[PDB]
Structures are given as C-alpha cells and as structure tokens.
Design a protein around this ligand. Structure first.
Ligand code: NA
Ligand code: NA
Length: 330
C-alpha cells in the first residue's frame, strides 16, 4: 500500500533510521540503518545502536509503495568489521553502485568502507579493508554537477571524530565528547574528493569551516549550531548546502557556501527536534520537488534506538533560505 502522505512511518515491518535518499533509475532509493532491539547497554558512546545489516528501500513515487529489497550487506561478511553498522550512503558511477558504510574495526575504531554492486538495491560485495585514511562515521557521498564525487563524513561523541585531530587515533581513553575547549572553534566535518574508481580518497582529508553570519567560527560551546554528525550536501541555485545534526540539541541545521570545501555560513534550522534523542536526515529532489527524509522514535513508543523513517516536502525560497520544518504541526 502507498506510504508517505501525512508524515507517517514509511515502513513498519522493521525499524529504520538515518535515511540517505537518492534518485537512481528514476526511482527513489533509500539507504537507512536497520535498527534492532539488541538489548545492549545504553550510553553516550552509542553502544545501544548495535545494527548488523542494511536493507535498501525504494519508492516509485512519493507517496508510494515502499519496497524492502532484503539484506544488501551483513556485518558478518565484512572482513574488517567488528561491530556497529551505522548510517550508510550510496553513489552511482559508470553503471556500478557503491555503498559506503561506517563500522568499528577489530580495534573498536570507526572506519568507513565501501561495497560494490551492479544494482542500486544490492546486494553489495564489501572490500576486504576500509578506505585508507577514513575514520569516524556518517559518510555522505555527493556527486557535484562537474562529475566530481566528494565524501563528507564525521561524528563526535560516539562517532570518535574528536579522537582524530592528528590523523592518528588518540586512543580509547581520549575525549568521549569533543575538544573540551568551548571557547575554541568547534570540530568541523571532514571532506575528501573520491578517486576515479570510487574505492579511495584522491587527496588528504580536509576539515570544513563553519562560521556564523559575522564570519566567526562556530565555537565548541555553541551546541545549538556546532557540528555533531550526519553531514549532508545538496545544491540549490548553484549554492552548496551543508546540513547536519547538532546532537545533544537535537536540530538539523544548514549552512551555505560557494564550493564543496566551504567555508559554510550557518543559516538556520532545517528540522526541529523529533521524538527520540537522535535526529538524522537527507535532502533530495525528485520529480522537481524537494523532500526531507528523516526519522523519529514514534513507532517504538519513544525508544531512542528503535526508529522509523519518514518524509516531508521541503521548501526553498528563491533567495536560498529554507523554511524550518517542525515535525508534529502540519
Ligand atoms: Na547522512
Ligand atoms: Na528558519
């Protein structure tokens, strides 16, 4: 039956989170986390998010019937992975499809790997090692209009980005949160141009600057605006939109720039806080309409680790501002 008309859950047979939406073969393909009730301890390092596989979803229209294509990748078949298959993303190039995914390696360090298929629905064959020079979580692979592909990535707290300031892991006894310098600039998300074969980075990883309207860096203590996780890139009017989750303040916010690397100037809120602690999204154009894919914990009765994905229309103004969405108003 058709789904996605009144911000209802898009699927109810499994718990779903972290929706990354793409238009491939004229259909919407969604690459979400598959939440499970693992019963692991709950904490600020995210051990309660103990996902083990990915199902790819697709829609021919919005609203529309949502197809669950089954397990596209299982952690048991990723040779380098130890635990925790967190939010994935996909890209298409030269008739191949690439699934990018964060997982903890056998030293319990988040890395980002790639898996390859001939179909947007998978299943995907993982590379035996993660991407060299990758770390942390939440990849978003963005195809720019010039044909260049960039991976945006990173997440603080349990995503470990705060432990990577020197390009080597600071250790399991390092900061559990951020730089612990609230009057210093906040940690920024990461970006790298992808190699032609889509399996590696084509440059040393860069860090993105996010500034306020006066041009000053967003500070570590500014939790309403500083980067937490879930970077996403989209373009409108030739402007680059970096949107992201603020984590402990529960917003999706956005910042605008004139090129993939930024700097990006904080503009405002995309999505106000939802039911459940986490907030994670993507923004996609389909048949000339823009959509915000997001999640909440409504289906599970408010359990933070058992989520369901939803969709709503997103409105850009011609000046490039975006109207803030509040999830439970209409
Ligand atoms: Na994302
Ligand atoms: Na606003």
């Amino acid at each position: 039956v058709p789904r996605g008309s009144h911000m209802e859950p898009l699927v109810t047979h499994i718990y779903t989170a972290d929706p990354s939406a793409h238009v491939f073969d004229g259909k919407v393909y969604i690459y979400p986390s598959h939440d499970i009730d693992a019963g692991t301890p709950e904490n600020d390092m995210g051990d309660h998010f103990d996902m083990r596989d990915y199902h790819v979803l697709s829609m021919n229209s919005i609203p529309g019937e949502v197809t669950d294509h089954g397990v596209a990748l299982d952690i048991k078949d990723i040779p380098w992975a130890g635990r925790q298959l967190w939010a994935p993303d996909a890209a298409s190039k030269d008739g191949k499809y690439y699934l990018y995914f964060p997982a903890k390696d056998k030293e319990d360090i988040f890395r980002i790997g790639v898996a390859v298929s001939d179909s947007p629905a998978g299943p995907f064959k993982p590379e035996s090692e993660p991407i060299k020079g990758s770390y942390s979580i939440d990849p978003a692979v963005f195809k720019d209009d010039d044909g260049k592909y960039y991976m945006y990535f990173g997440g603080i707290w349990g995503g470990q980005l705060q432990r990577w300031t020197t390009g080597e892991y600071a250790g399991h006894d390092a900061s559990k949160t951020d730089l612990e310098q609230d009057d210093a600039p906040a940690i920024g998300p990461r970006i790298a141009l992808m190699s032609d074969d889509m399996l590696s980075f084509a440059e040393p990883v860069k860090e993105i600057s996010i500034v306020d309207e006066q041009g000053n860096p967003i500070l570590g203590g500014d939790h309403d605006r500083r980067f937490f996780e879930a970077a996403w890139m989209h373009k409108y009017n030739g402007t680059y939109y970096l949107s992201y989750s603020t984590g402990d303040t529960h917003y999706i916010v956005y910042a605008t720039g004139d090129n993939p690397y930024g700097p990006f100037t904080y503009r405002g809120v995309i999505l106000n806080p939802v039911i459940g602690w986490t907030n994670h999204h993507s923004i996609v154009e389909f048949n000339g309409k823009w959509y915000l894919f997001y999640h909440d914990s409504s289906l599970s009765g408010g359990k933070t680790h058992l989520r369901c994905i939803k969709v709503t229309e997103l409105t850009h103004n011609a000046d490039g501002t975006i109207e803030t969405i509040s999830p439970y108003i209409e």
